[PDB]
Amino acid sequence: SEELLDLFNRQVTQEFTASQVYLSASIWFDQNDWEGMAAYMLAESAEEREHGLGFVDFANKRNIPIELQAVPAPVSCAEWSSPEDVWQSILELEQANTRSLLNLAEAASTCHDFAVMAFLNPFHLQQVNEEDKIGSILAKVTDENRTPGLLRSLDVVSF
Amino acid sequence: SEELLDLFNRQVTQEFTASQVYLSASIWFDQNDWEGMAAYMLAESAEEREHGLGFVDFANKRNIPIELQAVPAPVSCAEWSSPEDVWQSILELEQANTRSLLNLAEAASTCHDFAVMAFLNPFHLQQVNEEDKIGSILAKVTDENRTPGLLRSLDVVS
Amino acid sequence: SEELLDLFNRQVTQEFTASQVYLSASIWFDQNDWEGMAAYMLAESAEEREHGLGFVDFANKRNIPIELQAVPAPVSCAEWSSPEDVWQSILELEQANTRSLLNLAEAASTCHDFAVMAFLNPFHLQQVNEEDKIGSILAKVTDENRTPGLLRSLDVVSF
Amino acid sequence: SEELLDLFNRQVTQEFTASQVYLSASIWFDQNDWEGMAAYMLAESAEEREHGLGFVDFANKRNIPIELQAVPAPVSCAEWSSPEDVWQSILELEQANTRSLLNLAEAASTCHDFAVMAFLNPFHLQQVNEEDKIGSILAKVTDENRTPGLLRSLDVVS
Amino acid sequence: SEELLDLFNRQVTQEFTASQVYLSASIWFDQNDWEGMAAYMLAESAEEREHGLGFVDFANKRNIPIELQAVPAPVSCAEWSSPEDVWQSILELEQANTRSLLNLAEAASTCHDFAVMAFLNPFHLQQVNEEDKIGSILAKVTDENRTPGLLRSLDVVS
């Protein structure tokens, strides 16, 4: 179906966009001396790109044509003031990645595309884990950051 | 999706309930000198609990709120007088685990919960193997128990 | 000895009950982003079940009849609003486990059940260790929570 | 202490007595072509002797005077005409040994002999396991011998 | 020599005295859920005893008569209400031990006891390291305890 091919193409763009946003978070963290949180964001950036490549590769095999779209400039970095701002932005990113996979799966289900739904399954489960990890880091960051200097202690140690 | 959350919380209860029935089956076999069969039921009891912990872990990560319900006292163990009774009860238990997994999957499907459906898939297939395994053992048990003493050699060997 | 057969049977129930309470504590910790405390409670839940099975196995061989009772829904969890609440409830549970083991031993003693008395010995010892370990964690949790965010710091370090 | 010292000496004799009965059970099984059951009884005979020796050793260290009494000739072997009969005798042998271990423990408890009570603990636990094992074998022997030749078929599987 | 022989005997007592104070410090830390600090004090208690023994051994070889005196009950533990107090007591304990090692060395120097001075050399150096270590820990304990719960957080990191 039309809607599936459009949405599959969109996934790729979303994977790459997320990759750039993670890279952006990593730069903010490094600029502000959060090397542990920076390394985490760089690792996620690489992974989001791998997810994009995996979609490209499945599309190529299934003859879903991929036309690469622009990857927008990340903008949230203009407003980030603290680690909590960055993690919040990152949680919203993953929640959108999730929604985006659910919309693609629904479109696959509508046209009985069982191969695509099958392909999507490990991604649905990965998203559940991702959103859980980020939600949890954001809670820690918010909590630790109630005492001056304490958040700084667990970048240098845990990340 | 309020039905999905309810059936999920109930699924955990079903895993733990089944875990307790296997233990009772284990106890009946031990009390009646069927050590091999008791050992079997013990392993399955541990396994059912692991499934329950699996469901709990997924629900936590997915913000499906879990409230632990009572785990009922196993009841069929009061009735059992031969190994065939025990295995028949266990078959019915596995058939009930399967239905409650299929009902949970149906509620997930209805509300387009693709992650829950994805999570359930390995459980669907495992229920297929488990029912088949129980059904087969129950067939050997029924058959072998037609000769006095013969069923003891299923236990002593296998 | 009739008393002893009843208390032995209730002892199995108490192990499975505490197993379930430890689980409820795991859920609350996970729900509230305390993964180290959660994993700790989950390990405890497993070990409590193993003790239950140890009791069952002994009763089977000593011809003490085991009829498995219902395992009640844990109730404390409905009331917990901090890690300190949870650990306090865990202390009370192990103090309750200690008492039920001492009552069981006391009944064994009265009817000269030397085998059961011998059976319980490693459990008496184990309880001394469990209570001390929990009392101690509760002291650390209580102290560290006097500074905002600090308790969070040691869910990652310890555990 | 005199009751305790007498029962301790009595307990050595009971171990050695038990060892000889196990040996006569092994002779019987062997004479009757039950080699696996004979091997079982032979290992138990040596095991009973080892317990006797453990007792002797503790008594020497604790200055409990040991004088070796006669080891009575086993008489139960006169009545045995099937494997079931032999397993029944051994069960009762093991129950007899439990009771006199318990009698010894009560004498120790009355005279506050904490060291002797401590020494006895692993034996009390061992007896639970042994009576369970023997009771369970007897149940299997009894069930299997309901069909001609079947008991024979499971002796070679051990 | 009589001053030297008396101070040598006095020095054995001081080692054993120090060992007991370290042990009471470990009891305190333990009673108060400071397990890492308790482990530290426990290893130091055994270490102090080892030094006492080294002294005893040298005195036997050198024909310096040793008569073991009473090891006084530690009293400083009565006043301790925080980890800071305990570390302060231990620092002063270690400073007390340095001075009496130095007093022993001066008695040896006055009576030209070159062998005893040689024996003492590694202890003099060890004391420099120990007082430095204890002084440094105390500084950290004092700084960290300025923030509620913080001292607690660094006990588990050791």
Task: Quote the tokens at residue B74.
Answer: 């196993």
- Alpha-carbon C117 to chain mean position: 20
Q: Min CA distance, B130 vs chain C (Å)?
A: 24
Burial of E17 (0-12, 13-18, 19+ CB in 10 A): buried
Question: For residues C31 and C34, what is the distance between their CA atoms, to the nearest angstrom?
Answer: 8
Q: How was this structure determined?
A: X-ray
Q: Is D127 assigned to a binding site? A: yes
Contact list in D for residue B32 (CB cut-off 8 A) is 139
Q: Which residues contact C9 (CB under 8 A, 6 or more apart)?
A: C59, C64, C65, C66, C67, C69
Question: For residues D91 and B69, what is the distance between their CA atoms, to the nearest angstrom?
Answer: 45
Note whether D58 and D29 are within 8 A (CB): no
Chains C and E are in contact, defined as 3 or more C-beta pairs closer than 8 angstroms: yes
User: Which chain B residue has its CA at the smallest distance from C13's CA?
Assistant: B73
3-state DSSP assignment of residue B71: strand
Tokens 């541990």 appear where? B46
Q: CB contact, 8 Å: D120 with chain C? A: yes
Q: Subunits touching D (CB < 8 Å, at least 3 pairs)? A: B, C
Closest CA to C159 of C83, C67, C53: C83
Q: What is the per-residue burial (b if ≥16 Cβ within 10 Å, else e) of C12-34? A: bbbbbbbbbbbbbbbbbbbebbb
CA distances from B16 to B54, B93, C75, C159 (A): 11, 12, 17, 27
Note whether B8 and B105 are within 8 A (CB): no
Burial of E104 (0-12, 13-18, 19+ CB in 10 A): buried
Q: Which of residues 18-57 of E touch C (CB under 8 A)?
A: 32-33, 35
Question: For residues B118 and B62, what is the distance between their CA atoms, to the nearest angstrom?
Answer: 13
Question: For residues C69 and C56, what is the distance between their CA atoms, to the nearest angstrom?
Answer: 12
- C-D Cβ pairs (cutoff 8 Å, strict): 32
Helices A83-110 & A2-31, crossing angle to 10 degrees?
A: 170
Q: Min CA distance, A24 vs chain C (Å)?
A: 26
CA distances from D151 to D87, D122, D145 (A): 13, 33, 5
3-state DSSP assignment of residue C71: strand
Question: For residues C134 and C91, what is the distance between their CA atoms, to the nearest angstrom?
Answer: 6
Q: What is the per-residue burial (b if ≥16 Cβ within 10 Å, else e) of D32-71? A: eebeebbebbbebbebbbebbeebbebbeeeebebeeeee
Q: CB contact, 8 Å: D145 with chain B? A: yes
Residue C77 DSSP symbol = G
User: Which chain E residue has its CA at the smallest distance from C137's CA?
Assistant: E33
3-state DSSP assignment of residue B146: coil
Task: Quote the tokens at residue D109.
Answer: 């408890």
CA distances from A134 to A131, C131, E40, E73 (A): 5, 35, 39, 56
Inter-chain contact C114–D102, Cβ cutoff 8 Å?
yes
Q: Min CA distance, C76 vs chain B (Å)?
A: 11
Note whether D76 and D70 are within 8 A (CB): no
Question: For residues D105 and B73, what is the distance between their CA atoms, to the nearest angstrom?
Answer: 38
- Report CA torsion sign: D94, D100, D103, D104: negative
Tokens 């050992």 appear where? B39
User: Which chain A residue has its CA at the smallest distance from C35's CA?
Assistant: A136
Helices E83-110 & E35-61, crossing angle to 10 degrees?
A: 10
Note whether C94 and C127 are within 8 A (CB): yes
Domains of chain D: 1-158 (1.20.1260.10)
Q: CB contact, 8 Å: D128 with chain C? A: yes
Rounded to a whole number, what is the distance in angstroms from the first to the last CA of chain C?
43
Query: Could you give the maximum distance between any two Cα atoms of chain B, in Å?
Result: 55
Residues B73, B78, B80, B86: what is their CA dihedral angle, to the nearest 10 degrees?
0
Please report how many Cα atoms fall inside a 13 Å half-sphere around the Cα of residue D142, on the Cβ side. Answer: 12
Identify any residues that bridge with B71 across adjacent strands, giving them in sequence order: C71
Question: For residues C21 and C72, what is the distance between their CA atoms, to the nearest angstrom?
Answer: 9
- Nearest by CB to B74, which of C30, C65, C68? C68
Chains E and B are in contact, defined as 3 or more C-beta pairs closer than 8 angstroms: no
Q: CB contact, 8 Å: D3 with chain B? A: no
Rg (CA), chain B: 17
Tokens 């009640």 appear where? C72
Q: CB contact, 8 Å: D144 with chain B? A: yes
3-state DSSP assignment of residue D132: helix
- Nearest by CB to A128, which of B62, B112, B121? B62
Collect contacts of E116-124 with beta carbons under 8 A, ≥24 apart: E116/E4, E116/E8, E116/E62, E119/E58, E123/E51
Rounded to 5 degrees, φ, ψ at A26 are: -55, -45
Query: Could you give the maximum distance between any two Cα atoms of chain D, in Å?
Result: 55
Closest CA to E149 of D6, B81, C145: C145
Question: For residues A32 and A12, what is the distance between their CA atoms, to the nearest angstrom?
Answer: 31
Question: For residues B93 and B87, what is the distance between their CA atoms, to the nearest angstrom?
Answer: 10
Q: For Cα atoms B85, B90, B91, give the angle at the middle one, nearest 5 degrees.
A: 100
CA distances from C2 to C8, C13, C110 (A): 10, 17, 11
Q: Min CA distance, B158 vs chain D (Å)?
A: 12
- Alpha-carbon D77 to chain mean position: 15
Note whether B74 and B93 are within 8 A (CB): no
Q: Is B131 assigned to a binding site? A: no
Q: CB contact, 8 Å: D72 with chain C? A: no
Q: Give binding residues of C for Zn(2+) as ranges.
A: 15, 30, 35, 44, 47-48, 51, 94, 130, 132
Q: Min CA distance, A125 vs chain B (Å)?
A: 6
Note whether C90 and C22 are within 8 A (CB): yes
Tokens 């912990």 appear where? B53
Q: Min CA distance, A132 vs chain B (Å)?
A: 5
- Alpha-carbon B25 to chain mean position: 11
Closest CA to D146 of B30, B35, B146, B84: B146
Inter-chain contact C114–D105, Cβ cutoff 8 Å?
yes
